[PDB]
Amino acid sequence: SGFRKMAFPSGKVEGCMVQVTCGTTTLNGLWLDDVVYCPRHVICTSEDMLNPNYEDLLIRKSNHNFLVQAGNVQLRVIGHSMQNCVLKLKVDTANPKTPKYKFVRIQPGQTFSVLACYNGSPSGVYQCAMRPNFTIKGSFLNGSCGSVGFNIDYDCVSFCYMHHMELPTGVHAGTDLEGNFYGPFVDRQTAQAAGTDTTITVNVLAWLYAAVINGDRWFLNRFTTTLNDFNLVAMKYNYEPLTQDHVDILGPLSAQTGIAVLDMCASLKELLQNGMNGRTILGSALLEDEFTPFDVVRQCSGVTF
Amino acid sequence: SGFRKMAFPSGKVEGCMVQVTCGTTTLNGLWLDDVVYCPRHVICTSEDMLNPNYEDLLIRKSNHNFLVQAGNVQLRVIGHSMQNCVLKLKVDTANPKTPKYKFVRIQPGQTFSVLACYNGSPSGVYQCAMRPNFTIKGSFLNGSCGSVGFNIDYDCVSFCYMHHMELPTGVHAGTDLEGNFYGPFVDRQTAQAAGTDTTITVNVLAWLYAAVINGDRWFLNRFTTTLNDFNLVAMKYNYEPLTQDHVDILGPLSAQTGIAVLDMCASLKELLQNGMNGRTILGSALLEDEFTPFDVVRQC
Numbered sequence: 001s002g003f004r005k006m007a008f009p010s011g012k013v014e015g016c017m018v019q020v021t022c023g024t025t026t027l028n029g030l031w032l033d034d035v036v037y038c039p040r041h042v043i044c045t046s047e048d049m050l051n052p053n054y055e056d057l058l059i060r061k062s063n064h065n066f067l068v069q070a071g072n073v074q075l076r077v078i079g080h081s082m083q084n085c086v087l088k089l090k091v092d093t094a095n096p097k098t099p100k101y102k103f104v105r106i107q108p109g110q111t112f113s114v115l116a117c118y119n120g121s122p123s124g125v126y127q128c129a130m131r132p133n134f135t136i137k138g139s140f141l142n143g144s145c146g147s148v149g150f151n152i153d154y155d156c157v158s159f160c161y162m163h164h165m166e167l168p169t170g171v172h173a174g175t176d177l178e179g180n181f182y183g184p185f186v187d188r189q190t191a192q193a194a195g196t197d198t199t200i201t202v203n204v205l206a207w208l209y210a211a212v213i214n215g216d217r218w219f220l221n222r223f224t225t226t227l228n229d230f231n232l233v234a235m236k237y238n239y240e241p242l243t244q245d246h247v248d249i250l251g252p253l254s255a256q257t258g259i260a261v262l263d264m265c266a267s268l269k270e271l272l273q274n275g276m277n278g279r280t281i282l283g284s285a286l287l288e289d290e291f292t293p294f295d296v297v298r299q300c301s302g303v304t305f
Numbered sequence: 306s307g308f309r310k311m312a313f314p315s316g317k318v319e320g321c322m323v324q325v326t327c328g329t330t331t332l333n334g335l336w337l338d339d340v341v342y343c344p345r346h347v348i349c350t351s352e353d354m355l356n357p358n359y360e361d362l363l364i365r366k367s368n369h370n371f372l373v374q375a376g377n378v379q380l381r382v383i384g385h386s387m388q389n390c391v392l393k394l395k396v397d398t399a400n401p402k403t404p405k406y407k408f409v410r411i412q413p414g415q416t417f418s419v420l421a422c423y424n425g426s427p428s429g430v431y432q433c434a435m436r437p438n439f440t441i442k443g444s445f446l447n448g449s450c451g452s453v454g455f456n457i458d459y460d461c462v463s464f465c466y467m468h469h470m471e472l473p474t475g476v477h478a479g480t481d482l483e484g485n486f487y488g489p490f491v492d493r494q495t496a497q498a499a500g501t502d503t504t505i506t507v508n509v510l511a512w513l514y515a516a517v518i519n520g521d522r523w524f525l526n527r528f529t530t531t532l533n534d535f536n537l538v539a540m541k542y543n544y545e546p547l548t549q550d551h552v553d554i555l556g557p558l559s560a561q562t563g564i565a566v567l568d569m570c571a572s573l574k575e576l577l578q579n580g581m582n583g584r585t586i587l588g589s590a591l592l593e594d595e596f597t598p599f600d601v602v603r604q605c
């Protein structure tokens with residue numbers, strides 16, 4: 001029993017964290033094979049960062065300008081290139097600790113673990129979801145740039161995020177490992193504001209199923225709803241629309257708990273209009289939206305990595 | 306900026322997880338140097354669960370009764386001993402991945418990361434606190450026994466917990482890495498119930514300071530209180546008494562935020578009095594008690 005916000009074991013990712021220094025700037029890098037990946041703003045001064053020409057700043061760089069440190073050992077850079085907002089530093093040594101990995105771009109609502117690092121050294125690991133507005137509600141201080149977000153599939157690390165910046169509201173913005181920003185963000189000190197956030201409905205439903213599995217049933221009700229009626233209510237409360245794909249994905253949990261997806265939707269519908277009434281679900285007084293259906297199944301079935 | 310429940314990177318601990326099998330029972334073990342540590346109930350049968358005699362069951366065992374598996378490689382056990390509720394299996398190979406480590410016993414309110422494993426393989430990592438009643442509110446299925454709780458304070462892994470059992474209320478009981486149970490629990494299937502749990506007050510105050518640091522101030526007030534008046538209110542909500550030591554510990558946060566400890570105590574008094582009024586502190590609608598003053602300073 002028990003339900004926790006659980007991150008993937010970070011070991012395979014820790015073995016890839018290096019410190020990248022370019023001039024006065026020091027952030028983290030991801031060392032996979034003979035390439036180190038890091039945000040391209042490492043080649044930026046506070047003068048440059050207002051309106052930076054990265055293609056121009058990078059042509060003025062030589063391989064020795066990048067100090068790459070893997071532990072106490074300093075790696076030598078033999079090539080430098082840029083793909084979108086990520087810098088790629090070709091190195092002379094392949095990382096012996098390189099795991100089976102792949103670069104994946106995630107969709108909103110999807111969750112991942114973050115391995116927060118400072119000076120190429122991992123300091124913490126936490127779980128978070130890609131918000132529907134494309135920001136992550138992370139925990140990042142100065143120097144955390146280059147920290148990566150990942151998921152583990154069997155024995156394969158799927159790298160899906162690299163941290164670049166923090167918005168004025170305390171939320172964070174980053175890119176996939178191909179340098180493509182998540183959302184409408186740019187990698188420069190400019191006026192940028194996250195759009196109005198919405199609740200990830202399929203995850204709230206997955207989390208209600210996890211609560212039922214752990215014996216919390218007070219919120220269950222005799223009612224069911226149509227997918228259309230639920231969505232009309234969901235919009236009114238700033239909840240993401242629930243598609244037929246979300247209903248299909250929630251299928252195994254529906255079968256394991258004997259509570260049809262549209263039956264759980266009517267429980268969620270009552271919770272939104274009426275509230276908790278001083279009660280909690282899984283020790284929480286709010287509807288949690290940071291557990292995907294595959295997360296709930298993985299935690300309640302004991303899938304190992 | 307930002308405030309999350311953050312676990313320590315589990316890498317150093319993953320490299321120590323092995324599968325220990327004794328007859329029909331299979332749980333996890335912690336392989337440090339040439340010793341594998343695991344709960345002593347791996348040597349119990351169906352008949353030996355209500356009142357097993359472990360000293361007697363262990364003398365009837367031989368090294369070749371313990372199947373220790375590190376990855377696909379099967380380790381050879383060359384000695385077996387018991388220290389309190391933990392079994393120590395001396396092996397012929399030292400773990401190449403053994404980190405700088407130390408065994409520490411924690412006190413209620415202290416937090417640590419748990420590396421949940423099944424069949425010697427890490428499935429997940431999460432953060433939790435040692436409850437004032439000495440149980441942990443973990444996430445554990447059958448086979449997670451031997452999973453360890455730890456804190457990585459600069460390069461060194463402090464092992465402070467090993468999972469042993471699940472109480473009838475869904476909460477968990479375990480020991481330090483010296484086999485000493487946390488609380489009044491025994492490693493028998495006899496009727497055991499956790500005492501009524503209480504909120505870790507110093508942790509709620511530390512968490513309110515973290516919220517102020519991150520710009521959340523709606524809960525603040527013009528009031529201050531005596532430490533005695535605060536404690537009388539606290540017990541009425543099942544909150545742990547706040548000692549002078551807790552006030553001292555909250556000193557750096559009080560200085561960083563310019564909000565005296567007894568001033569925050571009056572904010573907490575008011576929060577207990579009215580509740581949240583549909584508002585949240587750090588994205589939560591309840592007062593979080595699984596962040597210590599040390600975690601709040603570290604994370605911020």
Ligand SMILES: COc1ccc2cncc(NC(=O)[C@@H]3CCOc4ccc(Cl)cc43)c2c1
Nearest residue numbers: 001346445446447449469470471492493494
């Ligand atoms: C369905 O069985 C479970 C489910 C979740 C579980 C989560 N953590 C641990 C489990 N095991 C136990 O607590 C064993 C089962 C029998 O009762 C005792 C009594 C004493 C001792 Cl030391 C161990 C145990 C779990 C066993």
